[PDB]
Homo-oligomer: A and B are copies of this chain.
């Protein structure tokens, strides 16, 4: 059974889970206080 893909066949995401946190990156590559 085939079907044409319409605008209702996509998934609403509207977000983007970053792999790693900004705080984590700052902690790991900031100059040591």
Chain A residues proximal to chain B, CB less than 8 Å: 1, 3, 11-13, 15-17, 22, 25-26, 29-32
Contacts and interface: CB of A to CB of B under 8 A. Distances in A.
A2 to B, nearest CB: 10
Contacts of A29: 13, 15, 17
Contacts of A16: 1, 3, 31
Contacts of A17: 29-32
14 contacts: A1-B13, A1-B16, A3-B16, A11-B22, A11-B26, A13-B25, A13-B29, A15-B29, A15-B31, A16-B31, A17-B29, A17-B30, A17-B31, A17-B32
Contacts of A15: 29-31
